[PDB]
Write a protein that binds this ligand. Structure first.
Ligand SMILES: *[PH](O)(O)OCC(C)(C)[C@H](O)C(=O)NCCC(=O)NCCSCCC(=O)CCCC(C)=O
Length: 86
């Protein structure tokens, strides 16, 4: 019932927020990899965040989206706010 955002969910959703950036690798452990390695833009991540905010019912300050380095931190932001909604 509580749709805790997993690595597999993120692997989908992250791609769902990238349009022209198709063809990266998000399958060979991207969780500790950096957004620069996975070819993610700055705006793309704001967008990724907003996507997740609106779907899961959370919120993340847009600057904090640019403060993350690795996807696990972004993921932490989501599930963190999600766990506050409980
Ligand atoms: P990232 O690490 O490249 O950082 C991006 C950003 C926007 C957080 C940062 O503040 C920045 O790029 N600052 C430079 C000054 C500036 O005004 N940048 C704008 C760049 S993109 C879009 C700006 C905007 O006002 C509206 C965009 C609306 C859309 C894309 O729909």
């Amino acid at each position: 019932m509580a749709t805790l955002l997993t690595t597999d969910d993120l692997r989908r959703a992250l791609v769902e927020s990238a349009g022209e950036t198709d063809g990266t690798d998000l399958s060979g452990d991207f969780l500790d990899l950096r957004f620069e390695d996975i070819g993610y833009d700055s705006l793309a991540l704001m967008e990724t965040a907003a996507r997740l905010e609106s779907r899961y019912g959370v919120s993340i300050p847009d600057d904090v989206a640019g403060r993350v380095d690795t996807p696990r931190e972004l993921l932490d932001l989501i599930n963190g706010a999600l766990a506050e909604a409980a």
